[PDB]
Amino acid sequence: AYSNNSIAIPTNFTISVTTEILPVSMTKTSVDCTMYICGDSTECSNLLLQYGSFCTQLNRALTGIAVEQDKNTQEVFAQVKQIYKTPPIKDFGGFNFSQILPDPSKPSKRSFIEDLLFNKVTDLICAQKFNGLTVLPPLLTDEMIAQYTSALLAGTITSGWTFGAGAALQIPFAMQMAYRFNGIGVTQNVLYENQKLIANQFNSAIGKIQDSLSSTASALGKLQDV
Amino acid sequence: VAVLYQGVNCTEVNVFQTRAGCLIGAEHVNNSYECDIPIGAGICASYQTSQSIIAYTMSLGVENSVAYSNNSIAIPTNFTISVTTEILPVSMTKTSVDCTMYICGDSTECSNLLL
Amino acid sequence: LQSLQTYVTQQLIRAAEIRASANLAATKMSECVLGQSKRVDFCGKGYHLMSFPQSAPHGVVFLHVTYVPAQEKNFTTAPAICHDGKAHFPREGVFVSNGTHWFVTQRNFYEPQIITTDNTFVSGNCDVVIGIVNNTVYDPLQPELDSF
Amino acid sequence: VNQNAQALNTLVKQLSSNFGAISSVLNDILSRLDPPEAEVQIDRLITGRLQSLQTYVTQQLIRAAEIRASANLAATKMSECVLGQSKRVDFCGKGYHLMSFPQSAPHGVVFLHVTYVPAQEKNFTTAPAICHDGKAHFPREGVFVSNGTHWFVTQRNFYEPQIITTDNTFVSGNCDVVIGIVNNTVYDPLQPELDSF
């Protein structure tokens, strides 16, 4: 409807949580030029050396790919050099983060969500190393990239927007949403009066995202395509 | 110098074994420091102390537990103006290569075969 | 050698594609996670609030907490209120009415507020404004000075 | 600069490779063997040198894609960081951005960014609201702070203690809803002015 004197203001809202899958790096592989022609023979070496430096430029090229692939993970995964920890006593104002927070009782540190993300994507590394394609392991293992994520989560729960721009400043998360609503044009009256309703909206949204990732395995297809 | 082998255990061969492969000439230290020359699979090396090359686990930085409470808040009482440095490329060398003189110059038969 | 050269050239093209996706993920890592971005449909649908990273093989998964309004109701508006002959323009928000009394409220949520001197401001006069309506602006100092 | 030097250097050195022929110099082959048997060696030399030139053009186009991604990123930092003021975090560099000073450099540009980072911090006691006559008060800009004695109003970015007044807060709701509300006395500036009058 279009009228000069008519206006619509929302009387109620909802908090939706979505998922966007962006690939970061791929598996680094470097193939040697002499063995790809043949091994244990001088005929491949004499006629292949007769073509000059082609092996050297293609090898330096694949090495350059493997170094930039470690550097892309370095500019994304680790933003800050300071590790943040989650306090043992948790009062967030009615929010349940135990699904997205790592579980220390597991032998490897991962969350309940990362446990499903590792299981929904299909040793194969040594199997590829058997045919002559060498897979070099990444500089950052799975436990430390997950530790970078748990550090960034623990900082958002505790320090909020402060540790990105400087030293970590402790702020309660109940007051943190007051600044996040004041930044988008929402009065903090919505937070302080409806906080109990927002707790059930967020906890139900996290349960729906966990159900979507568990029931639908095609949401990770962006990485499966890679 | 610490010689590193990639994707193989120690066969021929301060001989240690890591996830990246056989690493000879370096020492393994259980403590963890800031990385200098990286390798892979969470292990790197640096030259420290009668000094040699030591190999160690990736340090993720200083571990600091920020206190959190309902009524606790921290506000900064002072500030610092810092200048950082960002280097980005813009232009690269402009190159133009001619087919006849680059492949075969001063050759009439090869210049006619290129046309 | 030609088949291997085809492989390396195709890998270099994927290196440029994976670099465009990694720098886009690093940019969304800085704006969506550490701080709060006011950009629309960058951090995802709705008004952005917070982003939660999660480790995933060869990538990263973001959980975006956003503010999406749901229920609304049609109200009667007006750009200004004419009281003593000079226009009263809203400082923050808009003028709304249910058909009986004019209210002042923000655009992102409905929180009824009476017209006072602090929620509006005086600029210009009443003839030059198109769509201005007449009402009575409540003076907060009038009953206080009368009681004194 | 090293990728162009190494690319041009490989591009020149491939002329010295023989590519399966008798010699890399065309004068020794054309001055000895007859033209019909010699044309086979010339076709193998052109195809090999040709494969090196198409390899070079493919690497230059691929490197052209990275220099264009960096150029568009440089134009983006040039737009947001230099002329205006970007509120994006960790775009113009660590900290709250202020201004950027560009500097010419060979085959690129260097940006000098002025940032605002806090230094000293001090732990304070906070409350979401102030309960006075039975109706709640919320801060308009900033948060509520206390040193353990009196409740103050200050900004989040820096500490400027202020007495709770009616212009520094706004009246909404009541005291039985907001969790963590505290009781205090809201100062009204009209009272001493009327007492003096």
Numbering used by the authors:
A (entry chain B): 706 to 827, 848 to 951
B (entry chain A): 608 to 620, 641 to 676, 689 to 754
C (entry chain B): 1001 to 1148
D (entry chain A): 952 to 1148
The authors write:
The cryo-EM datasets for the same sample vitrified at 4 °C and 37 °C according to29 were acquired separately. Following the acquisition of these datasets and the initial steps of image processing in Scipion, we employed a continuous flexibility analysis using HetSIREN to further address the extreme conformational heterogeneity inherent in this sample and characterize subtle conformational changes between the two temperatures. To explore the entire conformational landscape and detect all potential conformations, we obtained 20 decoded HetSIREN volumes from a K-Means clustering of the original HetSIREN latent space for each sample. At 4 °C, our analysis revealed the presence of 1 Up and 2 Up conformations, which aligns with previous observations using conventional discrete classification protocols. At 4°C (a) the Spike always shows at least one (orange) or two (red) RBDs in its open position. The maps provide a sensible exploration of the different states identified by HetSIREN, including 1 Up and 2 Up conformations. To quantify the opening range of the RBD, we used centroids of two fixed regions within the core of the Spike protein (S2 domain) as reference points, specifically residues Val991 and Pro1140 from all three chains. Furthermore, we directly compared the local resolution computed by DeepRes20 between the HetSIREN maps and the maps obtained using discrete image processing procedures, including initial model generation and subsequent refinement. This comparison revealed an increase in local resolution on the HetSIREN map, with particular emphasis on the RBD and NTD, which are typically the most mobile regions and exhibit lower resolvability.
